[PDB]
Structures are given as structure tokens and as C-alpha cells.
Amino acid sequence: TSILELGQLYVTMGAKDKLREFIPHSTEYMMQFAKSKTVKVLKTLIEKFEQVPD
């Protein structure tokens, strides 16, 4: 909640080049609480950064 809301909380910001580097965090981080597939969270955040304007 204080980390996933960092990546989620910078989706409103919209600065792209780092948003490219947030999904590497949703790989790095999202798995450390549960090592099970984050490809749900991964994929959802992928579309979340892809739906970014332009």
C-alpha cells in the first residue's frame, strides 16, 4: 500500500520514461510478498501505462 501506490500514484503524474521503468518494479517488487505470477498485475499495469495519453 505504500509501494504499489507509488507506481499507481505516479500513473496520475504521467511522466513516461520512468513509467516504462515501473513495470520492471512490478516484476521486482510485486513478487516479493507472493512469488506467484504478477502477470495479472503486470498486464493490468501494462495497459495502465499504455492507455497513458498519446
UniProtKB/Swiss-Prot annotation:
Domain of life, per UniProt, equals Eukaryota
How does the record describe the protein's post-translational processing? N-acetylated by NAT1.
Subunit comment for this entry?
A: Component of the lid subcomplex of the 19S proteasome regulatory particle complex (also named PA700 complex). The 26S proteasome consists of a 20S proteasome core and two 19S regulatory subunits.
Function, in words: Component of the lid subcomplex of the 26S proteasome, a multiprotein complex involved in the ATP-dependent degradation of ubiquitinated proteins. In the complex, RPN6 is required for proteasome assembly.
Tell me its family. Answer: Belongs to the proteasome subunit S9 family.
**Other comments?**
Present with 16800 molecules/cell in log phase SD medium.
Full protein name: 26S proteasome regulatory subunit RPN6
Full-sequence portion shown in this chain: 56 to 109 of 434
